Amino acid sequence: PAMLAALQSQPDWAAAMDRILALTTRNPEAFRQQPQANRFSAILEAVVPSRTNPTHEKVLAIVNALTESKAIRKDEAGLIYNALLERVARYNSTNVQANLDRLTTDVREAVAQRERFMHDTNLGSQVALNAFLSTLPANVPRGQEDYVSFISALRLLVAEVPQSEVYQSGPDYFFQTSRQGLQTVNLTQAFKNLQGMWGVRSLLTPNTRLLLLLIAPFTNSSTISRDSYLGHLITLYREAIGQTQVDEQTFQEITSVSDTGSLEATL
């Protein structure tokens, strides 16, 4: 967000007194040959460099930052830029003209948090979930305490699938997405229909089934035993996921050999 300001403005002096002096490597005999007008319009630069006025540049180094995180929309950085320039062209001083400098050489460096924001989704995945888990009932359900293993598999899923896995709080009911596409929106305040079977050995509306199928991959010997339903189903969903991988590769193979066809004797 700065070199995009460098690569939007500011067309050096070492590179100029490295060429006039003929200290380059590839073609030293470069500056000598130019017309004796250029060679007298580049020698009086690396002999008495001309000052500059950097405000615009680093101000453009701030706009290109805002509009890349999300404030000032892409189409408004022609009013924001003028407004910022005129503000910093009023109150300017070594005061502000520096306070910028720090802002521009910190905003491009203090981007690690932003990177973190999208590397553990600690923006709407764990802060939301670790909020929703605090809206759950007490952590002592009656039947079993396979509860905690499931509720931890949920956190692991949300933390190890950065894709989007956003956890909205679309009003009273917090709902889990499986991707920004969102074609597996399962309601996470509607598994207070699993605070039923948390411990037993057709009452699951697929919404609950959707959550089970969504996390299952991330369950191993955790939700465990023959803890009824919740146990097996998870195991059966994992088995079905493996079989689905098998059938996926099989169908690609059988359609690369060559119409419903494979879809029948696969499904």
């Binding site: 615009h56 003028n82 320039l85 005129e86 062209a89």
Partner: protein, 46 residues
């Protein structure tokens, strides 16, 4: 310069040429700043 005789005062019109640039800038939206030059007679490096 030497021209043959006509009977109506004529006026020679030499055009000593020379570079004549102008480099408008446009900083803060609302201002245009112009800085001309003419190099064999000189003007507003303004």
């Amino acid at each position: 310069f030497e021209v043959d005789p006509m009977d109506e005062p004529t006026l020679l019109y030499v055009l000593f040429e020379v570079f004549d640039v102008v480099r408008i800038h446009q900083p803060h939206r609302g201002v245009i700043e112009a800085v001309y030059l003419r190099t064999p007679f000189s003007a507003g490096n303004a």
